[model samples]
Target: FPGIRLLSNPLMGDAVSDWSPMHEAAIHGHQLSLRNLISQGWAVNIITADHVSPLHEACLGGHLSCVKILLKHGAQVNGVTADWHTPLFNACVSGSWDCVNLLLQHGASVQPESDLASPIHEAARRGHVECVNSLIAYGGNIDHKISHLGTPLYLACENQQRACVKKLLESGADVNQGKGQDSPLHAVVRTASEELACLLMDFGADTQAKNAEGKRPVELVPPESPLAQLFLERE
Candidate 1:
């Protein structure tokens, strides 16, 4: 009895605690493992204890092939995790344009999963211009703001993602969109990058936009900083 080994189904005894073979296959790009379990009565969309579907794992891992297979097996492209991250949201984090587009093509929503940032905001923060464009293609709001993160344009400026700034501006992002009371101008002014400030102004940003602190963007900078001169000249 001691020498006898037991070989049971992978899911038979494995408890769901935010980990599983399906998630493993999806994330690790295990093509054969996916094919093997995708037979009749497979756990195609099995969720972990953390409430993440295999699709969520696949997208986050940037495993497009795994994603395709899981989708074919009826995985939910829009399934959310415990952290309120949808497959599309995780795909943005993965920086896989193909995976993100695939999710969109499969009916992934462009709306917020919770109070967290939108997928497009993640794209802008991560500086994925192609992903930004992809999200835009799927009706992602360029001006959607979180209570803490502001609009995508605000984040792009704050993160110094100039490409995202250009893309959002070209897409008609609201120049005055603010998080709390701080407008995108308020966010960019902190950057002290004249190019971004000029770009915002070119897109018709209000120089007089103020924040909760009751200060115009022009008044936010240190008097000795180079950006202070740019703001003064703007006035």
Candidate 2:
């Protein structure tokens, strides 16, 4: 019986669900095959076991053609996966502003189902400035903070995404409203990036702000690093 179970596990047909040929075609950007499948009445809105739709796949794959076709066929633009990944979030992860814009235009929620799955947060963390801009323009909260992920500005600073940091700041994100007690200035210090630190300060970051560790931005800097000198100059 044990050996039979082992063999059956390898040949299991129902273990995985919702990986239809339509999903495959969308991900690979096979326009003709995708069209054929849709024309044959394959549901464009079919979701995986995890709730991943064909549109989610196409957006994640940055396949603009597949995305358009799926949308035209009534794919759920705002369909969220079990873990809260929307097509917009996938688009941001792919760093494809075109996909992001299209999804938004098609009525995708600028806001994610949760802060941790926020497209703006993902875009900021990945340094996707255009997606961040699009999200902001669509009325996304620039300072929307996740319980553990901090604000988009803080995430940008922590990830060494200087352009996103600047963009968020220019768009009026709060410099000091980082995760809990960690300020954007505090996050930037960890990167040892003087430019980022300077940018944060230019945006009115609180140099004296202390994090949960009770360390100021300067206190976290290496004493001999150029960032320390820049901090001193700013102070």
Candidate 3:
């Protein structure tokens, strides 16, 4: 079909409703088809059966062109899915700093509350340093907390995201908090990065901090691990 428009085809079904051609175009970076769908009166913000929108699809796929097209078509820049993840959240998780910056430029804010669930948290936890940096540049809270998740800094350490930890520290994330503040200080003992452990210490992470189990940060370190020397030498 030289000029076939799949417009009249079924856009809804158990499978199709859950995923549309609009989503496909956005995810695959097909800006032309995306614009075509918008021009044809297709809801640019159409939600799939799974509650995912074209915006979410584009961000998840890291397709900047589709993101721009979708946004230009009046896509809800801050719209949330059924799980309430914003496009910026998706961008952070997708590790596309470009997409994250684009969404922020379009006025995407960090999601409410739950620092562990913040875009910064997702980017840091997944080792997306650039995304984390962009999020911070866009007014994301560096010290945002998630109750037991402590701060973004703690979550970064919990996942052994060294780059994230470095970025967070550089951004002035408060390293000293509750001994049980997400147990991230204790988490460093599990990684092979003594450099990371040292970085946390340099940022003033509490080495004597303990979790609910009464295990100090060093208590979690293997006896043969030299990273413990950081804590032991301090004591």
Candidate 4:
């Protein structure tokens, strides 16, 4: 059987290797292949050609059965991909609440970080409110800052994810937490998200914090917009 041969070798590089056969099975809901591969001793957490694990693939593909199978076989739910993205991050980015839940139930860390940002930041920027909630409930740090000195709330503001920003604020995220050169307000202004700027102000985000460029959030924006005026008024 092709399944048997493939499982025995477990090295058939194709969609199976570059993408992971289990992930393909999960994406397509191939319960039989999923069961067969697991039964055949294939590693559940095997990295695809792109360095994403089967768990990451299942989350991204929204394959609940595949997620279950992999977890049953001892796949690391919180495993980070080569880029440091967690399975929960993938599920959140893809808006797969079920997968996110399963991963969390299996101990997936919601606050996993890559070189760029944390999972909360990713969820916030993508406006995955449920995922963000799941993460926060699982102890995801609301005030966690990334290399850019921006927190989840900051990312949400920068991307104009209103609901996410509101959720973070309600959850006690620091509205004025950014450091020397990369405040959340600066990000909001740089992205021209006026709605987010106003929302941040409502949450008490400081508009006067200057970045390394010696520019406040208002200074980064067009002087004609009301948002710019709001920043000027703050100063």
Candidate 5:
């Protein structure tokens, strides 16, 4: 009757909720519970009701130990949640350098495209210098462009994260990597970041790129902004 009962209510069905006790354990860094759950045959890859996985929770919570344990149990390093966000992206977005490093060491791809923004873009946007460095070292594409034509450098510039921009440039991120009109330079000009504009120009961002609005990066700036004058001089 014991075996029959276990089979009748087996945990193998997809009906099991996504955020199980295992998900909570991993998110809260409950190592002992995680081990016990795994030993009891809980699927490490179970998705929550919202389609998030244990890996996503661990990374977003910055629980490095939980992340490592999940990786050891065969969790997909680059697993995408229902939102299409990878664990690495979530870690980067949260500025979790340790979690990002652990994910990378476990084979997370840095090529971008899994989501609208790569780990580099997320790290830059959040001003996470160490996380950005980890992503760059793991071969994240500096030139990755989103559908909006924004590059990691562009996002960093727009966010006024000087340290992040500097690190990205130092890592050889293309200062002018955006395409068709919304170039990285354009983003800098629009955001009125004079220091960032100068940095981009110094690193070879194109000042002449025009968007569908027939506006160059400088044209997007107000005439009174120092960056507007700066772009005029460059032209």
Candidate 6:
């Protein structure tokens, strides 16, 4: 007589290269389920095709409980994804200070592996003031500049993240340190933000600074708008 066998691995093979159920559990904040999977021997650090980890998903979704569970299960906090996005970058993008602070505490580097994607830039451009503060307090460079994204200050101004601009400036970010020749003042001109322009000027932004296009900040303002008149009278 032949005996029937019923043997299988405890962890199911992923159909999609380890973008496992654990990733979903973390991303969706299924804390208990995440713990259960980890208890069953699922690798907490398992990543997707693009190298995204469960911690990255948890942080991106602002799932604090899930994040805690992943960290407790040994998730890599500073793990870089395919696009150079870290778990901290995802937390900032999600505007979750709790996650940001926790990640920082877990030794997440404030700096990005590449200038192309800085966590400070992400927080600033998204107008997440608290996240910006947490990143800075964790030793993030305020003047970090991407070849295409500019400095955090310039990015904040360009995106109309007023509070971020203010916070960055207050934290000793360079007002004149923009993307190459373009100043933060030049970035604000694109938004016609009189208040932001005033803030830049007060911070000693060079009104005379020219851009890569050789256009001054004032020149970019609409000639028909009152902002043009304000800039014109500045110098």
Tell me the alpha-carbon RMSD of every candidate: 6.2, 5.5, 5.4, 4.6, 5.3, 6.6
lDDT of all predictions: 0.81, 0.84, 0.75, 0.74, 0.77, 0.84
The CA lDDT at 204 in model 5 is 83
Candidate 3: residue 156 lDDT (0-100): 74
Which of the predicted structures, 2 or 4, would earn the higher lDDT when compared with the native?
2
Candidate number that wins on TM-score, 1 or 4 = 1
Instruction: Give the worst 10-residue stretch by lDDT in candidate 4.
Output: 1-10
lDDT of 2 by residue, 119-234 (tens): 99999999999999999889899899888879988888888888888888888898889999988888778877778888988888899988898999899988998888887887
Q: State the TM-score for model 4.
A: 0.80
- Across 1-235, the per-residue lDDT of candidate 6 in tens digits comes to 1111122344764345646688888888899999898889777878776777888999999999999988887788888777989999999999999999999999998996777668888999999999989988888888887887789899898888888888888888999988888788887777778889999888888888889899988789778888788777876
Per-candidate TM-scores read 0.87, 0.88, 0.83, 0.80, 0.81, 0.88
Task: Write down the worst ten-residue block by lDDT for model 1.
Answer: 1-10
| Residue-pair clash count for candidate 4 | 0
Superposed model 6: Cα runs more than 4 Å off = 1-14, 222-224
Q: Please, what's the RMSD in Å of model 5? A: 5.3
Q: Which pairs in model 4 have colliding backbones?
A: none
lDDT of 5 by residue, 1-235 (tens): 0110111224666554544788789788887888899899887777764557788888888988888888888887776665778898889877889999888888888754565647877888778989978877887766777766477777787788888888888888877676456777787676676788888888888888777788778778888888877777766
Kindly indicate the candidate among 1 and 2 with the higher TM-score.
2
TM-score of 1: 0.87
In every candidate, how many clashes are there? Answer: 0, 0, 0, 0, 3, 0
Q: Rank the candidates by TM-score, best first.
A: 2, 6, 1, 3, 5, 4
